[PDB]
Design a protein around this motif. Sequence first.
Motif, PDB file in Angstrom:
ATOM      1  N   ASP A1100      27.051  41.041 -31.470  1.00  0.00           N
ATOM      2  CA  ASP A1100      28.166  40.103 -31.563  1.00  0.00           C
ATOM      3  C   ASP A1100      29.279  40.462 -30.588  1.00  0.00           C
ATOM      4  OD1 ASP A1100      27.017  38.431 -33.373  1.00  0.00           O
ATOM      5  OD2 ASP A1100      28.438  38.816 -35.001  1.00  0.00           O
ATOM      6  N   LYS A1101      29.467  41.757 -30.318  1.00  0.00           N
ATOM      7  CA  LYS A1101      30.541  42.174 -29.421  1.00  0.00           C
ATOM      8  C   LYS A1101      30.330  41.621 -28.016  1.00  0.00           C
ATOM      9  CE  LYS A1101      32.947  46.435 -27.819  1.00  0.00           C
ATOM     10  NZ  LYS A1101      33.021  47.919 -27.900  1.00  0.00           N
ATOM     11  N   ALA A1102      29.096  41.660 -27.516  1.00  0.00           N
ATOM     12  CA  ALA A1102      28.778  41.178 -26.180  1.00  0.00           C
ATOM     13  C   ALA A1102      28.123  39.803 -26.195  1.00  0.00           C
ATOM     14  CB  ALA A1102      27.882  42.181 -25.455  1.00  0.00           C
ATOM     15  N   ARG A1103      28.359  39.010 -27.243  1.00  0.00           N
ATOM     16  CA  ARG A1103      27.747  37.687 -27.323  1.00  0.00           C
ATOM     17  C   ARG A1103      28.207  36.796 -26.178  1.00  0.00           C
ATOM     18  NH1 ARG A1103      30.879  33.703 -30.350  1.00  0.00           N
ATOM     19  NH2 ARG A1103      30.471  34.683 -32.377  1.00  0.00           N
ATOM     20  N   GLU A1104      29.494  36.848 -25.847  1.00  0.00           N
ATOM     21  CA  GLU A1104      30.007  36.074 -24.726  1.00  0.00           C
ATOM     22  C   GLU A1104      29.469  36.629 -23.414  1.00  0.00           C
ATOM     23  OE1 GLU A1104      31.410  33.110 -24.426  1.00  0.00           O
ATOM     24  OE2 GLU A1104      30.933  33.661 -22.356  1.00  0.00           O
ATOM     25  N   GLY A1105      29.099  35.730 -22.508  1.00  0.00           N
ATOM     26  CA  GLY A1105      28.616  36.139 -21.206  1.00  0.00           C
ATOM     27  C   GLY A1105      27.119  35.989 -21.039  1.00  0.00           C
ATOM     28  N   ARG A1106      26.382  35.995 -22.143  1.00  0.00           N
ATOM     29  CA  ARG A1106      24.933  35.856 -22.112  1.00  0.00           C
ATOM     30  C   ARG A1106      24.492  34.757 -23.075  1.00  0.00           C
ATOM     31  NH1 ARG A1106      23.967  40.728 -25.758  1.00  0.00           N
ATOM     32  NH2 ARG A1106      23.687  42.031 -23.897  1.00  0.00           N
ATOM     33  N   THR A1107      23.184  34.527 -23.099  1.00  0.00           N
ATOM     34  CA  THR A1107      22.548  33.545 -23.964  1.00  0.00           C
ATOM     35  C   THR A1107      21.561  34.266 -24.870  1.00  0.00           C
ATOM     36  OG1 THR A1107      22.775  31.731 -22.371  1.00  0.00           O
ATOM     37  CG2 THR A1107      21.046  31.536 -24.027  1.00  0.00           C
ATOM     38  N   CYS A1108      21.483  33.847 -26.130  1.00  0.00           N
ATOM     39  CA  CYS A1108      20.577  34.481 -27.075  1.00  0.00           C
ATOM     40  C   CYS A1108      19.882  33.427 -27.921  1.00  0.00           C
ATOM     41  CB  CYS A1108      21.320  35.474 -27.977  1.00  0.00           C
ATOM     42  SG  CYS A1108      20.255  36.453 -29.056  1.00  0.00           S
TER      43      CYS A1108
END
Length: 1157
Positions: A1100-1108
């Motif tokens: 959740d911390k690095a959710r922004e910036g990528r796609t999951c």
Amino acid sequence: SVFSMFRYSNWLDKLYMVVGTLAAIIHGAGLPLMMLVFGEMTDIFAMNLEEDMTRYAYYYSGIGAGVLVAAYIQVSFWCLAAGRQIHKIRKQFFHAIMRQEIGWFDVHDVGELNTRLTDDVSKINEGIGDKIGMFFQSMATFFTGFIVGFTRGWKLTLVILAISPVLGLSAAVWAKILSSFTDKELLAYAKAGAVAEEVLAAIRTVIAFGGQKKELERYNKNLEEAKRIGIKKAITANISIGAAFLLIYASYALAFWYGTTLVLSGEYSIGQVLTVFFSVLIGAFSVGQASPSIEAFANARGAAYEIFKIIDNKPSIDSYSKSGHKPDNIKGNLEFRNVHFSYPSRKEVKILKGLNLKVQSGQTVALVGNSGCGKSTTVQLMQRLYDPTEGMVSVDGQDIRTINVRFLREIIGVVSQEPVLFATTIAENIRYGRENVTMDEIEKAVKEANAYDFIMKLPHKFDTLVGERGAQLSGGQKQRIAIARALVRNPKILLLDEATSALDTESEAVVQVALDKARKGRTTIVIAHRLSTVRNADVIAGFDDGVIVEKGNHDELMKEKGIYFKLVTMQTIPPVSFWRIMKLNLTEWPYFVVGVFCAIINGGLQPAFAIIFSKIIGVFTRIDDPETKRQNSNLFSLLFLALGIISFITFFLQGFTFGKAGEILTKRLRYMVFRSMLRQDVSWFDDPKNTTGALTTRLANDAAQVKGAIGSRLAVITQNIANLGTGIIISFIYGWQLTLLLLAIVPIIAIAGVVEMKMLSGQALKDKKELEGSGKIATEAIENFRTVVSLTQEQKFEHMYAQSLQVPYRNSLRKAHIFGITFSFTQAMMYFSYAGCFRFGAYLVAHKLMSFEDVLLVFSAVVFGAMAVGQVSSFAPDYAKAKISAAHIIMIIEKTPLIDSYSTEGLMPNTLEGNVTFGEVVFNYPTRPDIPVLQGLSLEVKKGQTLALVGSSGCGKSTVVQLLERFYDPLAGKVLLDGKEIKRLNVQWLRAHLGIVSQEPILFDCSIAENIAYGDNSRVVSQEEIVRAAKEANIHAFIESLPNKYSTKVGDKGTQLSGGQKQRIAIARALVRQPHILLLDEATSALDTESEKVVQEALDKAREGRTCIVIAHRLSTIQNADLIVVFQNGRVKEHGTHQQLLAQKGIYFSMVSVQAG
Ligand SMILES: Nc1ncnc2c1ncn2[C@@H]1O[C@H](COP(=O)(O)OP(=O)(O)OP(O)(O)=S)[C@@H](O)[C@H]1O
Ligand SMILES: Nc1ncnc2c1ncn2[C@@H]1O[C@H](COP(=O)(O)OP(=O)(O)OP(O)(O)=S)[C@@H](O)[C@H]1O
Ligand SMILES: [Mg+2]
Ligand SMILES: [Mg+2]
């Protein structure tokens, strides 16, 4: 120690060997007996010719039939004996492999074993075959020649003989050295085969992570070392023959120097000397005939080492022993007392520091705790897979170590944490639980395990063919099939290890109801991380530091506010001539040129010895001045010496340049072939004809078969062809009108060879098609040994292997008769030709059309090719098999796939933002084209979003994950990354960005550090990044607490770790890339609530910036998803945010209403 490979010989095999040795002696005693009349005529030449040559022809004609019988009796019996002992050795080797225990499998690497049945056995098949008969024939010829030399001469023969013991000692020493070398060569080949099977078993992960090149080089290193050993082996094998020939010619020169004293002493006549030389010299070529047989025997003796080392072992917990105890009225009672245990791989670490437990009949015990306490450890300890270091485990009071192992394991039905299925049909997989099961029992079990619906939905309802390790089924269907397999057994004691993970809520409820319906008569142990399934357990217990701490009912434990309370609160067929392989060997052409030239030189000299002998006959029959006899003959004394010096130079090179040229090519023949299957499409690996065993057998088999005929064996064929050519040319030059008679038999021998080649070629293809099937069973049983031991199906696999070894046995038996008949025919026709030529020479000298002094020379030159004809005729089976071997190698090398991993054509944009668009995507799998899995779905994903895919088990949620990695291509529809077709994009570039976590992760046999670093290839991953990823996956603390922190090897497919630990390691491996697109597939299926919270916060911390894109069943994980897509028979029926789908009371509402307490 020595002669340990003949220890499976009956009375019949010993009789075969004895009669074959006698026939070989009789057949080899033929040639030296023809020199007596030769010498008699020579002495008489220094009304009678038509009286002597006719009876000589009569004797030759009789010897012809004698040879015709003896050669067949010699060849066929030895071949039959070799075939029978090879069959027995294979069968007993597999039996001895089955007898070993689990700890032995953990300590050792089983990867070698699969390549020890195929190649290592076959080498023995060459050392104990007809080669021993050929060696015996050569020895008989040697001794018979020396015997007739003794009869016709007293001192010269002894002088020649005075140099035999050193020859024997040299042969023994060289054989001993190269037998030792063969062991290391085979060990390197075994390492290469283990690497090959490890790569091929986990091909999907290797393709996903693009690590083909690294595995290719890792496989190439072992081949390089094998070539390095083979070069030395060839060098020493060549010195072995070179020294022998040099010593032989030096002995002949000394003998001639002594024999030239006949003029001075007058003791002997020229005829006696000619007889002695012409009779002794046959042994000089008999030694050259014998040497390759000694080489092959030494190779087989060096090969048998590991086979008999494995068979000679004795296990401690033997499942085949019947010397145990067994009760009749077995009551369900389990008792653990002071159990201390440590795994053999890591003996320093302690896993169970002493726990005690009591379970009564009709009781359900649940074990709850974090990952690593040892729940599956004690589950395995129950089946007596291992023996505890201290304490004792007992059932109904009696100790486990006392009762019978097979009986104990036959009353325990176990569902392991990760099911493993076999490469058979569904019905066979169910039937593996108990051998004698009717269809009604199978139907009842698959109805009780809630597996009846999808089985009936498939075509070939109960005969649907699942893939290797059950890879062609779904993730939940596999678990249901395993549950049904366990339920067929109808066990007294049932042990479940998280059998409720892949199943959704409805299937879990159905299975739980069906299980509780018959709970009274069983004893049950359940391992689970979910707590709803543990709510209705009879007794719940808690693990801590390996020791049990809590006990009692649900309410008592809740009041105890212990570990259980804390966890509850937290939960709240083209034929090819092999000349193409010759062309592939073009680069090493100077080696072939030197080899051919040297072979021509040293092959065409044996007939020229006839001219030399005739010249020294003439030098004696001079007119005056005996001093020149001391002089001129002295010149000849140098020549025999000089040739020897050339012989040492030549007989070496002839084998070396050829022998090296094979070693260079064989490696190149494997390196390319492995480079080809490593490129093939994934759909190629789903073909039932292609399985890990088939491929790993093919790799060794094709190259070994080609090398058998391509190696140094071709040098002697070239030498013997040159010998025949030189002999016929010599006969044509000096003599005449006799070459036509000698050629009168070439058509008959040609027809015999043609028919033999046709029949052996027809046989070899059918043998090869079944050897792969024989190896598949061996690899399938070896890779899944824990499941086989737990199901006690070791006898059925042995029977299947013995059944598979049937057709090759019959083919080997028939080849014996075929080869023996052909060998005898070609060996007898030539003696008949000798008799005919002698009679015709008598007629021609009677009519004064040609002298006798030169037909004598012609006969002497022509007779020297009998052994050469035998050697050439002994080349049929090797070429016969090498033809199809080369054809198949060329076929596999020239094949090209559709989705090319190695190609460079494509589009590689500099920057991407990460939109994923599925538009009207339909798809059908290749193995089951009729079944529609996707029926026109559409999926839309933007950057910085999370999509959760939900649906019933088997609705196509991992199919989209497979499609996005370009494992398969859809029949129609569109798949777009950043508004660009993935078809037009580069494959390797596409796979290098997005990282995935499979539904069941697979690791490799190496350290944890290399396993984590494997995520990002084409780059050296720093240790700091590895440690950071491990911390992000919440496994750093466990790794650091482990001795040999990051250098501990994980077992085959990751078995030296628990399910949660290796799932965390897989997550860490996927997070090293820092991928722009992440694909999670049940990544949190088997994880503690603490590791789950840590990993979720990290993602959740690095959710922004990528796609999951996440696929899961736990609704807590789906709660944080940005949007949710619901499947329905392939289509997408619900899509939107969490709140919008919460308002739309559909399937998601149904799944969320059932998780309420
Ligand atoms: N074959 C093995 N050889 C050596 N160590 C092993 C082996 N299998 C498991 N271990 C070790 O045993 C410990 C935990 O093993 P398990 O008993 O399987 O844990 P677990 O209770 O199964 O975890 P869960 O609840 O299934 S997620 C770890 O330290 C592993 O490294
Ligand atoms: N190799 C294969 N060949 C043919 N059909 C397959 C193969 N693998 C899976 N299937 C089928 O395709 C469907 C997709 O299911 P799987 O992806 O294998 O597992 P799953 O339970 O569906 O997991 P998901 O995420 O829900 S797709 C199922 O009906 C499978 O039986
Ligand atoms: Mg476990
Ligand atoms: Mg599934």
